[PDB]
Amino acid sequence: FNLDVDSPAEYSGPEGSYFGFAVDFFVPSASSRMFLLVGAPKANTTQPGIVEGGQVLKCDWSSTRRCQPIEFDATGNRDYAKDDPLEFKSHQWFGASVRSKQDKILACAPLYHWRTEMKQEREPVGTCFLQDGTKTVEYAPCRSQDIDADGQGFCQGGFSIDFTKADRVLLGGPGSFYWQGQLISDQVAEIVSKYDPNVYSIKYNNQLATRTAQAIFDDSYLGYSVAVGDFNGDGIDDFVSGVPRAARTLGMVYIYDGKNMSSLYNFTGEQMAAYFGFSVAATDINGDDYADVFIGAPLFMDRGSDGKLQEVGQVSVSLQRASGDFQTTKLNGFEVFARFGSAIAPLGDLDQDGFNDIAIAAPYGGEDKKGIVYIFNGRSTGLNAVPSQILEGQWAARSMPPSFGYSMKGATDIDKNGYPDLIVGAFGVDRAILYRARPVITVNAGLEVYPSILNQDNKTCSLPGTALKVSCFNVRFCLKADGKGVLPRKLNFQVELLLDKLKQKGAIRRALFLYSRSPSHSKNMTISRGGLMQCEELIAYLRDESEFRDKLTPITIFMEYRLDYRTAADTTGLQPILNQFTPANISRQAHI
Amino acid sequence: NICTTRGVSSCQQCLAVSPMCAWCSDEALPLGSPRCDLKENLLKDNCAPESIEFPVSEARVLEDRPLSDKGSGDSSQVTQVSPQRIALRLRPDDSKNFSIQVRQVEDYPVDIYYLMDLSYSMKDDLWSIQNLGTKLATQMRKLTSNLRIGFGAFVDKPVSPYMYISPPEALENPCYDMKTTCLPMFGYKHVLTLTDQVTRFNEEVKKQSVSRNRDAPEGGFDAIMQATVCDEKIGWRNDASHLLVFTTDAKTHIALDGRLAGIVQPNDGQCHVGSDNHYSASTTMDYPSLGLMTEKLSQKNINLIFAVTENVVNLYQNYSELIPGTTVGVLSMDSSNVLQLIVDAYGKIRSKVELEVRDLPEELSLSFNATCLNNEVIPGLKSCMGLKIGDTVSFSIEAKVRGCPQEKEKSFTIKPVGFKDSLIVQVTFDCDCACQAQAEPNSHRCNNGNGTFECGVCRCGPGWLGSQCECSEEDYRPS
């Protein structure tokens, strides 16, 4: 429920660049500044003789919201010999994958091709650039001497990437060994220290990699997607990967041990061509030490009320347990051909309630098919199966589908308010957008009447007017409010009260406030955040037997409270929100 | 009963209580009798017959042409579904039933489009089918007077992971390292438009040759889509059975596989075959998903036949289980049996009837009891199996409405799979009484202009209560 939808920040790249195809935050240790990283894999660059080389842009959060390229490489193609190019950087898709961790940025070109040291082939090995600080290096584990389709020549290394808690890269290459696919993992210190610009097939000593297998595993695409998390309890992150063509095209997810690359677990799809493993994520959703596995199947078909198959898409949620089992639940999409589950993004704890939350995209859903992101909350029982917010794309096709939500990143607080934000990519319109999480207020409200029962008998109100004594009742109300993170210490609530609230057709009211001589009261009330309940009290009274006949129905007291959001807004204009289970009104009753 | 025990607040509310309820709309009814009741109780209380305002459901056939005995000659007059149009009346919770009857008419026209994998292993096949047209017309003469045959071919998207791109000779001849000649790679090409000049199939097939590609999966679904949606290019008739015969010896690429080529635009299901008969979007747009193929195969009434070799039969069986109106047959490793494969598959395509439903409103639902053979019944089933060409089958359908719909009229279509013969249902909702045409707000009679006009009894605006609106509602009073 918590993202600011009315004032999000837009960023745009060049027309047709695919700006927004990959997104991440950049949070250097060296300074207080933070940035968005955006990949634009079809962008033109100043590199000599290169067409659509792709680039990564570093985009500022405040004030001017400038984007500028990162200079990972300014060179054209290297030469193996005179008029014999070593490599082919045109159309390489650089920035199709982007990640960062502290000062480290890793970005990749899955469609980079090279001419082997042995023969004039043109093989899509893929390549990555790692920037460690002031220093940039090339990492290309598939540019090995294993040079054919039966080896690593078609690897496309860096088609997906991630960083572990300890400094290792995990890298996927879906094309190795006749498209069986491969995972590789290297230590970041080993990548940076073994780099040499004169050696094209560098060997790293601490490398972990998956091996070639029997021909029945060909065309499986291991490494099409990757994520990391601990799945055997030793504190080292294990490697999770989507294998979307495995098991006769049901699709699979494989988990490998992060210290030795042996297999821990397999998950399998239940429908062919559903693409189970297009996206994977790992995060603790239910508040344990144990991380839980999220698997997207964007093309999954369920059966409608008429029994017809319809292409809604699905996510599978697998809660880890201490026994080594998983408890599995399935979550279907809401609209036909929307491709629900195309991207999955751990948000961290989005509303600070104690359980982590997740965003799931449907990039071809919504009105005009502009794309939707659905937000789901964690609970002690698992994921809450009902989405608590919907984010919607706001640009027309112009002319490919906008694809809003095809890439996402959460779990970083960019403006330091205490709540983690979300970046959404919309690469079909060359655009990326930042949604900021609002501060959440929990309100406790009290309403009380002292005499729960009266018989027009306790005639004791002297009344500021006529001399006759009137039957009183004391009525009182209270508020307290608080929230985690950054928000103003004083909050203004409009508090509003009604007497006889159920009979309000313009019919005669029998209960009135003593000083007002009316059935209603309104009060601008300022309260300070914390445990101290703040209260006010009024005298009200019941009218004479001459004035009304209905002695049978209860007198109902009703209270509403509204926060002055425009006064509680921070210096950036971000307004807080009331916690979604807060009842905006409360009632009491008395009998006569 | 339910009608008298709910509030008698208006004729419109009374009809919304239950399908059994009726309403007396004139002053002859004795006061204190509930105005909403079963119609016989309104007659016991001497309500006038024209006053009782009781709509009852009906299902009237507006167009009801008899089923044909022959598919030959009569063309647009051939009829395979018995009621063609029906008017159906409903009220806010009611159900009504009607019968549809369907025939697999014999000697009906047939269009066969032959869609061929031309990867390098298919040379034995391409040599074997070079006289298939005159053999196919000789066997199909038993089954149809009016055959048309056409041809098209596929390999896969001509892009880096799938096609040879070095040395430069391999762009012009993908077979150069095999020391032989084959064509440059192509995604899909149309070759022969559907024609009854059967010798054109033999002429055009003799001019084809194979190409070559890197990985084992083939781009065949990208070709099934274009062979479906390019109507005037392929030449599909309105009045025919459509058979799309898909041949391959290999597994296939599927939606989201194109991301390895840098292709990320979803398949739009439009026609992109140009003046050169090649599929122009092949390098820029992703492969179809099974749901998009299923939609277009249904929209165009095509029956798909997977004619595939033993090494992949189970794969295409498990895809056939996800697509309606579809079947599989075991192709020989040289296509030498493909003639009997088409003739037997056409039998398996006519041994069923199954019903589609289209445009059905969210307020409606349907249920089906199928008669099939020997005047049996199968309850809850939209289908029959084990039939023959010339068989007739019946279904009884019941439609129910949930509440009153906000639009008074709508329509939906019931149709067999693979045919354009259909039953069109027009629905009308009787949520309203006829007396509401004589209503008036702040009317005469009643009390001091506080009554909306009666339809049977005065209805108050705010502040008032009673059968002539004669008491204030602000608290209870005898006056």
PDB file of N, CA and C in Angstrom, chain A residues 430-484:
ATOM      1  N   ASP A 430      11.845   3.731 -23.608  1.00  0.00           N
ATOM      2  CA  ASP A 430      13.194   4.203 -23.265  1.00  0.00           C
ATOM      3  C   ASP A 430      13.228   4.999 -21.958  1.00  0.00           C
ATOM      4  N   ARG A 431      12.590   4.459 -20.916  1.00  0.00           N
ATOM      5  CA  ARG A 431      12.262   5.182 -19.687  1.00  0.00           C
ATOM      6  C   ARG A 431      12.430   4.315 -18.445  1.00  0.00           C
ATOM      7  N   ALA A 432      12.790   4.932 -17.333  1.00  0.00           N
ATOM      8  CA  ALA A 432      12.838   4.311 -16.016  1.00  0.00           C
ATOM      9  C   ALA A 432      12.213   5.254 -14.992  1.00  0.00           C
ATOM     10  N   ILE A 433      11.600   4.719 -13.947  1.00  0.00           N
ATOM     11  CA  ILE A 433      10.822   5.500 -12.987  1.00  0.00           C
ATOM     12  C   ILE A 433      11.088   5.030 -11.561  1.00  0.00           C
ATOM     13  N   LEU A 434      11.190   5.971 -10.630  1.00  0.00           N
ATOM     14  CA  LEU A 434      11.458   5.725  -9.219  1.00  0.00           C
ATOM     15  C   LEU A 434      10.214   6.011  -8.380  1.00  0.00           C
ATOM     16  N   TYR A 435       9.766   5.006  -7.639  1.00  0.00           N
ATOM     17  CA  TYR A 435       8.696   5.109  -6.661  1.00  0.00           C
ATOM     18  C   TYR A 435       9.292   5.095  -5.261  1.00  0.00           C
ATOM     19  N   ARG A 436       8.966   6.101  -4.452  1.00  0.00           N
ATOM     20  CA  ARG A 436       9.467   6.232  -3.085  1.00  0.00           C
ATOM     21  C   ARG A 436       8.452   5.729  -2.078  1.00  0.00           C
ATOM     22  N   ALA A 437       8.890   4.978  -1.079  1.00  0.00           N
ATOM     23  CA  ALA A 437       8.005   4.484  -0.033  1.00  0.00           C
ATOM     24  C   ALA A 437       7.693   5.576   1.003  1.00  0.00           C
ATOM     25  N   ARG A 438       6.409   5.789   1.295  1.00  0.00           N
ATOM     26  CA  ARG A 438       5.915   6.805   2.239  1.00  0.00           C
ATOM     27  C   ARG A 438       6.113   6.355   3.690  1.00  0.00           C
ATOM     28  N   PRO A 439       6.351   7.258   4.654  1.00  0.00           N
ATOM     29  CA  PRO A 439       6.349   6.886   6.063  1.00  0.00           C
ATOM     30  C   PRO A 439       4.981   6.371   6.511  1.00  0.00           C
ATOM     31  N   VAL A 440       4.932   5.276   7.267  1.00  0.00           N
ATOM     32  CA  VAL A 440       3.670   4.664   7.712  1.00  0.00           C
ATOM     33  C   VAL A 440       3.392   5.019   9.162  1.00  0.00           C
ATOM     34  N   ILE A 441       2.214   5.574   9.427  1.00  0.00           N
ATOM     35  CA  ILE A 441       1.741   5.909  10.770  1.00  0.00           C
ATOM     36  C   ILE A 441       0.740   4.846  11.219  1.00  0.00           C
ATOM     37  N   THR A 442       0.921   4.292  12.413  1.00  0.00           N
ATOM     38  CA  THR A 442      -0.100   3.484  13.085  1.00  0.00           C
ATOM     39  C   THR A 442      -0.795   4.359  14.121  1.00  0.00           C
ATOM     40  N   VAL A 443      -2.122   4.456  14.035  1.00  0.00           N
ATOM     41  CA  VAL A 443      -2.949   5.276  14.929  1.00  0.00           C
ATOM     42  C   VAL A 443      -3.777   4.376  15.829  1.00  0.00           C
ATOM     43  N   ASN A 444      -3.769   4.634  17.133  1.00  0.00           N
ATOM     44  CA  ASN A 444      -4.730   4.050  18.060  1.00  0.00           C
ATOM     45  C   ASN A 444      -5.676   5.148  18.544  1.00  0.00           C
ATOM     46  N   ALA A 445      -6.974   4.932  18.357  1.00  0.00           N
ATOM     47  CA  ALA A 445      -8.026   5.871  18.721  1.00  0.00           C
ATOM     48  C   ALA A 445      -8.901   5.287  19.833  1.00  0.00           C
ATOM     49  N   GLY A 446      -9.284   6.116  20.799  1.00  0.00           N
ATOM     50  CA  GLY A 446     -10.199   5.755  21.881  1.00  0.00           C
ATOM     51  C   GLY A 446     -11.432   6.649  21.889  1.00  0.00           C
ATOM     52  N   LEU A 447     -12.600   6.068  22.151  1.00  0.00           N
ATOM     53  CA  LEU A 447     -13.862   6.777  22.357  1.00  0.00           C
ATOM     54  C   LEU A 447     -14.592   6.150  23.547  1.00  0.00           C
ATOM     55  N   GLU A 448     -15.113   6.962  24.461  1.00  0.00           N
ATOM     56  CA  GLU A 448     -15.796   6.491  25.671  1.00  0.00           C
ATOM     57  C   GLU A 448     -16.977   7.391  26.050  1.00  0.00           C
ATOM     58  N   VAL A 449     -18.028   6.789  26.603  1.00  0.00           N
ATOM     59  CA  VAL A 449     -19.111   7.480  27.319  1.00  0.00           C
ATOM     60  C   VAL A 449     -19.121   6.974  28.757  1.00  0.00           C
ATOM     61  N   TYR A 450     -19.183   7.860  29.749  1.00  0.00           N
ATOM     62  CA  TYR A 450     -19.145   7.442  31.155  1.00  0.00           C
ATOM     63  C   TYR A 450     -20.436   6.708  31.581  1.00  0.00           C
ATOM     64  N   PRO A 451     -21.639   7.318  31.532  1.00  0.00           N
ATOM     65  CA  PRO A 451     -22.884   6.600  31.795  1.00  0.00           C
ATOM     66  C   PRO A 451     -23.325   5.812  30.552  1.00  0.00           C
ATOM     67  N   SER A 452     -23.105   4.497  30.546  1.00  0.00           N
ATOM     68  CA  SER A 452     -23.531   3.628  29.436  1.00  0.00           C
ATOM     69  C   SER A 452     -25.060   3.524  29.289  1.00  0.00           C
ATOM     70  N   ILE A 453     -25.807   3.802  30.360  1.00  0.00           N
ATOM     71  CA  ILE A 453     -27.273   3.742  30.446  1.00  0.00           C
ATOM     72  C   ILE A 453     -27.779   5.015  31.143  1.00  0.00           C
ATOM     73  N   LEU A 454     -28.893   5.593  30.688  1.00  0.00           N
ATOM     74  CA  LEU A 454     -29.547   6.744  31.328  1.00  0.00           C
ATOM     75  C   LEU A 454     -31.067   6.722  31.096  1.00  0.00           C
ATOM     76  N   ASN A 455     -31.857   7.372  31.956  1.00  0.00           N
ATOM     77  CA  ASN A 455     -33.328   7.337  31.888  1.00  0.00           C
ATOM     78  C   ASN A 455     -33.952   8.746  31.965  1.00  0.00           C
ATOM     79  N   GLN A 456     -33.272   9.742  31.385  1.00  0.00           N
ATOM     80  CA  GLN A 456     -33.587  11.175  31.521  1.00  0.00           C
ATOM     81  C   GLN A 456     -33.696  11.621  32.998  1.00  0.00           C
ATOM     82  N   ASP A 457     -32.944  10.955  33.873  1.00  0.00           N
ATOM     83  CA  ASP A 457     -33.103  10.958  35.326  1.00  0.00           C
ATOM     84  C   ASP A 457     -32.048  11.814  36.041  1.00  0.00           C
ATOM     85  N   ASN A 458     -30.778  11.732  35.631  1.00  0.00           N
ATOM     86  CA  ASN A 458     -29.659  12.470  36.236  1.00  0.00           C
ATOM     87  C   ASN A 458     -29.621  13.957  35.808  1.00  0.00           C
ATOM     88  N   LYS A 459     -30.751  14.665  35.922  1.00  0.00           N
ATOM     89  CA  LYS A 459     -30.946  16.047  35.449  1.00  0.00           C
ATOM     90  C   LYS A 459     -30.110  17.032  36.266  1.00  0.00           C
ATOM     91  N   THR A 460     -28.935  17.371  35.738  1.00  0.00           N
ATOM     92  CA  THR A 460     -27.854  18.061  36.469  1.00  0.00           C
ATOM     93  C   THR A 460     -27.077  19.077  35.628  1.00  0.00           C
ATOM     94  N   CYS A 461     -27.188  19.055  34.298  1.00  0.00           N
ATOM     95  CA  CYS A 461     -26.574  20.056  33.421  1.00  0.00           C
ATOM     96  C   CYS A 461     -27.304  21.387  33.592  1.00  0.00           C
ATOM     97  N   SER A 462     -26.630  22.410  34.115  1.00  0.00           N
ATOM     98  CA  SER A 462     -27.235  23.733  34.340  1.00  0.00           C
ATOM     99  C   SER A 462     -27.537  24.494  33.039  1.00  0.00           C
ATOM    100  N   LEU A 463     -26.777  24.211  31.970  1.00  0.00           N
ATOM    101  CA  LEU A 463     -26.895  24.738  30.600  1.00  0.00           C
ATOM    102  C   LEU A 463     -26.658  26.272  30.467  1.00  0.00           C
ATOM    103  N   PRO A 464     -25.778  26.736  29.553  1.00  0.00           N
ATOM    104  CA  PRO A 464     -25.530  28.166  29.325  1.00  0.00           C
ATOM    105  C   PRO A 464     -26.679  28.823  28.532  1.00  0.00           C
ATOM    106  N   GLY A 465     -27.800  29.091  29.203  1.00  0.00           N
ATOM    107  CA  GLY A 465     -29.059  29.517  28.584  1.00  0.00           C
ATOM    108  C   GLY A 465     -30.230  29.527  29.572  1.00  0.00           C
ATOM    109  N   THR A 466     -31.282  28.754  29.285  1.00  0.00           N
ATOM    110  CA  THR A 466     -32.465  28.596  30.153  1.00  0.00           C
ATOM    111  C   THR A 466     -32.136  27.904  31.486  1.00  0.00           C
ATOM    112  N   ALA A 467     -32.930  28.164  32.528  1.00  0.00           N
ATOM    113  CA  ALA A 467     -32.569  27.812  33.907  1.00  0.00           C
ATOM    114  C   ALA A 467     -32.783  26.332  34.299  1.00  0.00           C
ATOM    115  N   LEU A 468     -33.608  25.577  33.563  1.00  0.00           N
ATOM    116  CA  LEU A 468     -33.964  24.193  33.914  1.00  0.00           C
ATOM    117  C   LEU A 468     -32.789  23.223  33.707  1.00  0.00           C
ATOM    118  N   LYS A 469     -32.591  22.295  34.648  1.00  0.00           N
ATOM    119  CA  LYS A 469     -31.506  21.302  34.599  1.00  0.00           C
ATOM    120  C   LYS A 469     -31.793  20.205  33.569  1.00  0.00           C
ATOM    121  N   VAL A 470     -30.756  19.737  32.874  1.00  0.00           N
ATOM    122  CA  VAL A 470     -30.860  18.802  31.733  1.00  0.00           C
ATOM    123  C   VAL A 470     -30.080  17.507  31.998  1.00  0.00           C
ATOM    124  N   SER A 471     -30.508  16.376  31.434  1.00  0.00           N
ATOM    125  CA  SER A 471     -29.860  15.072  31.651  1.00  0.00           C
ATOM    126  C   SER A 471     -28.547  14.948  30.864  1.00  0.00           C
ATOM    127  N   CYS A 472     -27.409  15.041  31.556  1.00  0.00           N
ATOM    128  CA  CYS A 472     -26.078  14.986  30.953  1.00  0.00           C
ATOM    129  C   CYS A 472     -25.611  13.564  30.618  1.00  0.00           C
ATOM    130  N   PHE A 473     -24.634  13.466  29.720  1.00  0.00           N
ATOM    131  CA  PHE A 473     -23.656  12.385  29.690  1.00  0.00           C
ATOM    132  C   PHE A 473     -22.280  12.950  29.320  1.00  0.00           C
ATOM    133  N   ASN A 474     -21.222  12.477  29.978  1.00  0.00           N
ATOM    134  CA  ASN A 474     -19.845  12.809  29.612  1.00  0.00           C
ATOM    135  C   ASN A 474     -19.379  11.895  28.472  1.00  0.00           C
ATOM    136  N   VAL A 475     -18.764  12.467  27.443  1.00  0.00           N
ATOM    137  CA  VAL A 475     -18.199  11.744  26.297  1.00  0.00           C
ATOM    138  C   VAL A 475     -16.780  12.232  26.031  1.00  0.00           C
ATOM    139  N   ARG A 476     -15.836  11.312  25.839  1.00  0.00           N
ATOM    140  CA  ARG A 476     -14.412  11.638  25.674  1.00  0.00           C
ATOM    141  C   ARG A 476     -13.761  10.826  24.579  1.00  0.00           C
ATOM    142  N   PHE A 477     -12.757  11.413  23.953  1.00  0.00           N
ATOM    143  CA  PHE A 477     -12.032  10.789  22.862  1.00  0.00           C
ATOM    144  C   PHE A 477     -10.537  11.033  22.985  1.00  0.00           C
ATOM    145  N   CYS A 478      -9.756  10.129  22.408  1.00  0.00           N
ATOM    146  CA  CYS A 478      -8.312  10.110  22.539  1.00  0.00           C
ATOM    147  C   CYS A 478      -7.645   9.618  21.259  1.00  0.00           C
ATOM    148  N   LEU A 479      -6.419  10.068  21.024  1.00  0.00           N
ATOM    149  CA  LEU A 479      -5.534   9.575  19.976  1.00  0.00           C
ATOM    150  C   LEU A 479      -4.129   9.334  20.528  1.00  0.00           C
ATOM    151  N   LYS A 480      -3.439   8.356  19.951  1.00  0.00           N
ATOM    152  CA  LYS A 480      -1.977   8.318  19.873  1.00  0.00           C
ATOM    153  C   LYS A 480      -1.560   7.838  18.490  1.00  0.00           C
ATOM    154  N   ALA A 481      -0.368   8.220  18.060  1.00  0.00           N
ATOM    155  CA  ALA A 481       0.182   7.812  16.778  1.00  0.00           C
ATOM    156  C   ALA A 481       1.694   7.617  16.868  1.00  0.00           C
ATOM    157  N   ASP A 482       2.237   6.677  16.103  1.00  0.00           N
ATOM    158  CA  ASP A 482       3.683   6.557  15.891  1.00  0.00           C
ATOM    159  C   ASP A 482       4.005   5.795  14.597  1.00  0.00           C
ATOM    160  N   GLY A 483       5.251   5.882  14.144  1.00  0.00           N
ATOM    161  CA  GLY A 483       5.771   5.180  12.978  1.00  0.00           C
ATOM    162  C   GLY A 483       7.293   5.125  12.992  1.00  0.00           C
ATOM    163  N   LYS A 484       7.863   4.106  12.352  1.00  0.00           N
ATOM    164  CA  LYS A 484       9.318   3.952  12.182  1.00  0.00           C
ATOM    165  C   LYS A 484       9.872   4.955  11.167  1.00  0.00           C
TER     166      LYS A 484
END
